[PDB]
Amino acid sequence: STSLSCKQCQETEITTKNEIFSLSLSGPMAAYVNPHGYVHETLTVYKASNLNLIGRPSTEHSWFPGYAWTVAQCKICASHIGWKFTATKKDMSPQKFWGLTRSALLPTI
């Protein structure tokens, strides 16, 4: 499957298209609005590599109820890629996934 890489540096593979899944009704990728009016077309994938996390998980304005987010940045260039999502309870499946923002990745999905 097609590799997706950081748009800014194009030095790392972050994920592959075979990781894509639909978490809910809105297909594998949809537009979501953050608290300040930024719109992120967020693709959900089971596994991602070559990302670094900032800080600790938060449920604030979570787009996926039952999950907390942690900001995820390219390990090379520190560009914002998306968020790691982690379940806040045991009955959630999957227990973790990544939401990657379309505009941070190449190729364009």
Binding site: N34, P35, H36, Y38, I54, G55, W69, H80, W83
Partner: peptide
């Protein structure tokens, strides 16, 4: 511990000066 937040992605920072650079780099 990290009181400064980026309004585009939610990244948090202990130093406001690092927040300012981080916001710039979203461009």
């Amino acid at each position: 511990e990290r009181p400064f937040h980026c309004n585009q992605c939610g990244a948090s920072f202990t130093q406001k000066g690092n927040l300012l650079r981080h916001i710039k780099l979203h461009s």
